[PDB]
C-alpha cells in the first residue's frame, strides 16, 4: 500500500550559495602540519546548491539523479529524513539499493524492488499516550531478488521534538567508484534558522561498501491519515561534484584545517 | 615513468623475472636521468659560488 | 674483500694508492628476520551448515546456497581424508588457500555410489543430463563422502529419488522441479497413469545392505567465479608474531618492506592506517591486530671513509665510519 | 652462417595442447615440474605430431609425466625420483595412502 499525498502549497525551488562546503578525507594517510596538493572530485567553492524544505504545507520528495557522487546537507529537528533510495531505474529492471535509518534498527540492503511513486513513512501524532508511534511503512510493492542485506544492532532514537531553530546539521556526501560506495558524514550542533552556515570542516569516511552495480538516480525518505498530514520542519540542500585540484593543510594534530581551490 | 608502479617491491611481488625487467629498466632510466640533471645543476651553482 | 685497503685498491684500479682519504663501501645493518601482520580477522564462513547439515535434499532438488562476506578456511576441509573424493577443476588445489573469489555458491545433494563419475564436466548419463549438468569449462570443486550410516534405512528410504525421464538435456545449474508424467513414447497421454507414460521421478534403493556403488553419497558442488567482481570472501591472511627494535623485513596488510619498528605517539585518526613523509615514504603503520602507532625507520647506513698514507710509505690504514655513533659497529 | 662450440638436441614426446609452454619464462605443470628452460636461451624449438607413429588404440601408457613435486626445478634439471608425494598435511609412509 502506497498513496499519493497532494495537499500542499505550490512553490518554486530555490538556490543557495555553497560557500566552502564539501571537503573530506580521500585516503587513510596520516600527515601532521603538511601542505599537500591533490586532484579529485569535489564541490568547487561558491557554487549554487538546490534548496528544499518541509514545513508544517511542504512535503517534497522528488526523484533526483546520482552522478559522480552528490552532496546532501540537512538542517533539521527531530530527525525527519530517515531513508535513502538508489538505483539506475528503480523499478526491478536493474538491481537497486535501500537505506533505512529506522527508529529501532538500521536496515541496509541491495535487492530487486518496485518502489512506489511516493514512498514514505508515517509516525502518528500524539495518539492519546503522548508518544509518537510509527505505523506507516510505504516503500515498495515487492522484493523479487536479493543479493545483499544487512541489519545492525537495534537502538533507540526519538520520534518527537519541536524547536524553532534546527539543531542537527547533518552533512553527507556519497560517491560510487568501481562498485565501492563511500559515504562521508558529519553531524553538527547548529543554531541557524533557514540557511546553510559559513565554515570549514572535512568529512570522515563512514561507509565503504563493495556492491558492484550501476546507480543513476536517488530519492530520500521523509516522515509524516492517508489524506491530510503534518510534517516536521526541516530543510536540506543538494549539490554536485566536479573534477578539480585542491591544496590541503594538515595541522600538528593531523587534521585538515583548510583547503584551497586551484 | 610509464612503468607499472613506483614501488620496486610491488613490481617484484606481482610480476615475473622474464617480465619485470622492462619495468625496472624504465625505473632506472627515469631516476638516472633525474640524478644526472641534479649533478649538472649543483655543479653549475658550485662554479658560481 | 680481504681488508679495506684492498677494497680501496680494487675500487681505484691500481696496486699503489697515494696518500689521502677515499670514499668506498656504503654498508647497512642487514635485516635479519621475517614478519607478517594481518588483523584479528576471525569471522568465518559457515562450512558446517553446508557440510555437517543433518539432511541434504535429493539430486532432482539440489540445494543451492551462496556464501559471501566472511573468512573461508578450505584447509580443514582439504586435509580431511574422510571424504570419498575432492575433484577440483578450475583451480590447482594448493592455490585455493592462497587465491580467492568474489562469490561462493554451494550445491549439496545426495546421489548413488556408482553415479559419482557423471558429476565430471561435459559428461553424459542419467544424472549428468537428466538431473544436474556442469559446464564444459566449470570453475569449482566437487566434494563427495559416503553417508550410508547417516540417512539410509534397512526398509529403504524412497524419499531420496532421482530423475529418469526428461524431455531434453539440461543447461548447467538448472533445476527440474516438474513432476509431469513423461511420455517416453509417441502416443498422447494424460491422467495419472497410462501406457508408455512413466512418472519421471524414480526411486533409489538406499539400504545399508547393498554393495559398493549402491550407497547414498553426499556430494556438494562449489561454483565460484574469478576476477570479475570485487572479492568478498578471501580468508587466508596468515600473520606471525610481532618483533621490534631490530632491522627486519615486514608485511603489514599487503605493505611489504624492511626496517625497524618503534613505538610512536603520533595521533592517528581512527580510520587512518598509514602515515607518510613530506616527500611520501611510509614510516607510520598502525598494527592491524591491536591499534598502536609504529614508527618505521630504515636501519642505519653510511659510507666508509678510508684514510691511508702512501702505499710507498706503509700499508697501515684507518677507517672512518661517518654519521654513526659507533655503538653498533660490526655489521 | 654461424659456428658453435657444440649443440644439444633434447628430445621427448608430449601432448600437443601443452606445446605453448615450451618458451622460456613460461609456467605450468610441464614448464614447472619436469622440464625447465633458462631465460638466456639461444636455440630453437621444433614440434610435430607423431599421431600415426606411436599413438595406438589400446593406449600408450608408458608415457608418464611428473604431476606432483615439492618444489620447482632448476633449468636443465632432470628428475626420476618415484618417492610418493604427500598432498595433505597428513604424513604418509609405505607406498600408498
Kindly state the number of beta strands of chain A: 17
**Overall 3D geometry of chain A?**
globular
Total helices of chain A: the number is 0
Rounded to an integer in angstroms, the radius of gyration calculated over CA atoms of chain A is 19 Å
Structural class of chain A: mainly beta
Element pattern of chain A in H and E: EEEEEEEEEEEEEEEEE
Query: How much of the residues of chain A is beta strand, in percent?
Result: over 45%
Oligomer: part of a larger assembly
- Most extensive interface, chain pair and sizes: A-C, 18 and 17 residues
PDB class: viral protein
Keywords: Prototypic SARS-CoV-2 spike V417, viral protein
Entry title: Prototypic SARS-CoV-2 spike (containing V417) in the open conformation
Chains A, B, C, D: Spike glycoprotein
Amino acid at each position: 500500500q502506497c498513496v499519493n499525498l497532494t495537499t500542499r502549497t505550490q512553490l518554486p525551488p530555490a538556490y543557495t550559495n555553497s560557500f566552502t562546503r564539501g571537503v573530506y578525507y580521500p585516503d587513510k594517510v596520516f600527515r601532521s602540519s603538511v601542505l599537500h596538493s591533490t586532484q579529485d572530485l569535489f564541490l568547487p567553492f561558491f557554487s549554487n546548491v538546490t534548496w528544499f524544505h518541509a514545513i508544517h504545507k511542504r512535503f517534497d520528495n522528488p526523484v533526483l539523479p546520482f552522478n559522480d557522487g552528490v552532496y546532501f546537507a540537512s538542517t533539521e529537528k527531530s530527525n525527519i529524513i530517515r531513508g535513502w533510495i538508489f538505483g539506475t531505474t528503480l523499478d526491478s529492471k536493474t538491481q537497486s539499493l535501500l537505506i533505512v535509518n529506522n527508529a529501532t534498527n538500521v536496515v541496509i540492503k541491495v535487492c530487486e524492488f518496485q518502489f512506489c511513486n511516493d514512498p514514505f513513512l508515517g509516525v502518528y501524532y500524539h495518539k492519546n499516550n503522548k508518544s509518537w508511534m510509527e505505523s506507516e511503512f510505504r516503500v515498495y510493492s515487492s522484493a523479487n531478488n536479493c543479493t545483499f542485506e544487512y541489519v545492525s544492532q537495534p537502538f533507540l532514537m526519538d520520534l518527537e521534538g519541536k524547536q524553532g531553530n534546527f539543531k542537527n546539521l547533518r552533512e553527507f556526501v556519497f560517491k560510487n567508484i568501481d562498485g565501492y560506495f563511500k559515504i562521508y558524514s558529519k553531524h553538527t550542533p547548529i543554531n541557524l534558522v533557514r540557511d546553510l552556515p559559513q565554515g570549514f570542516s572535512a568529512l570522515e569516511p563512514l561507509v565503504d561498501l563493495p556492491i558492484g552495480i550501476n546507480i543513476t538516480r536517488f530519492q530520500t525518505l521523509l516522515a509524516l491519515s492517508s489524506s491530510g498530514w503534518t510534517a516536521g520542519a526541516a530543510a536540506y540542500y543538494v549539490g554536485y561534484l566536479q573534477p578539480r585540484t585542491f591544496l590541503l593543510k594538515y595541522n600538528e594534530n593531523g587534521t585538515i584545517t583548510d583547503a584551497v581551490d586551484c | 615513468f610509464g612503468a607499472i608502479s613506483s614501488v620496486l617491491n610491488d613490481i617484484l611481488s606481482r610480476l615475473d623475472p622474464p617480465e619485470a625487467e622492462v619495468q625496472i629498466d624504465r625505473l632506472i632510466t627515469g631516476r638516472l636521468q633525474s640524478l644526472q640533471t641534479y649533478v649538472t645543476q649543483q655543479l653549475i651553482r658550485a662554479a658560481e659560488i | 674483500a680481504l681488508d679495506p685497503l684492498s677494497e680501496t685498491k680494487c675500487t681505484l684500479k691500481s696496486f699503489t694508492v697515494e696518500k689521502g682519504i677515499y670514499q668506498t663501501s656504503n654498508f647497512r645493518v642487514q635485516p635479519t628476520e621475517s614478519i607478517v601482520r594481518f588483523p584479528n580477522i576471525t569471522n568465518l564462513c559457515p562450512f558446517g551448515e553446508v557440510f555437517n547439515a543433518t539432511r541434504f535434499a535429493s539430486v532432482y532438488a539440489w540445494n543451492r546456497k551462496r556464501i559471501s562476506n566472511c573468512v573461508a578456511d578450505y584447509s580443514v576441509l582439504y586435509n580431511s581424508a574422510s571424504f570419498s573424493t575432492f575433484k577440483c577443476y578450475g583451480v590447482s588445489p594448493t592455490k585455493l588457500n592462497d587465491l580467492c573469489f568474489t562469490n561462493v555458491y554451494a550445491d549439496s545433494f545426495v546421489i548413488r555410489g556408482d553415479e559419482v563419475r557423471q558429476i565430471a564436466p561435459g559428461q553424459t548419463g542419467v544424472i549428468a543430463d537428466y538431473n544436474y549438468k556442469l559446464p564444459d569449462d566449470f570453475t569449482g570443486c566437487v566434494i563427495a563422502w559416503n553417508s550410508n550410516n547417516l540417512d539410509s534405512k534397512v526398509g529403504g528410504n524412497y524419499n531420496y529419488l532421482y530423475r529418469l525421464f526428461r524431455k531434453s538435456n539440461l543447461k548447467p545449474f538448472e533445476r527440474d522441479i516438474s513432476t509431469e508424467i513423461y511420455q517416453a513414447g509417441s502416443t498422447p497421454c494424460n491422467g495419472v497413469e497410462g501406457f508408455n507414460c512413466y512418472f519421471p521421478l524414480q526411486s533409489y534403493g538406499f539400504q545399508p545392505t547393498n554393495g559398493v556403488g549402491y550407497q547414498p553419497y553426499r556430494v556438494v558442488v562449489l561454483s565460484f567465479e574469478l576476477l570479475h567482481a570485487p572479492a568478498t570472501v578471501c580468508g587466508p591472511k596468515k600473520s606471525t608474531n610481532l618483533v621490534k627494535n631490530k632491522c627486519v623485513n615486514f608485511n603489514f596488510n599487503g605493505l611489504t618492506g624492511t626496517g625497524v619498528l618503534t613505538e610512536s605517539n603520533k595521533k592517528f585518526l581512527p580510520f587512518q592506517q598509514f602515515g607518510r613523509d613530506i616527500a611520501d615514504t611510509t614510516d607510520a603503520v598502525r598494527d592491524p591486530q591491536t591499534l598502536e602507532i609504529l614508527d618505521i625507520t630504515p636501519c642505519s647506513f653510511g659510507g666508509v671513509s678510508v684514510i691511508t698514507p702512501g702505499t710507498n710509505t706503509s700499508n697501515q690504514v684507518a677507517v672512518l665510519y661517518q654519521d654513526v655513533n659507533c655503538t653498533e659497529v660490526p655489521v
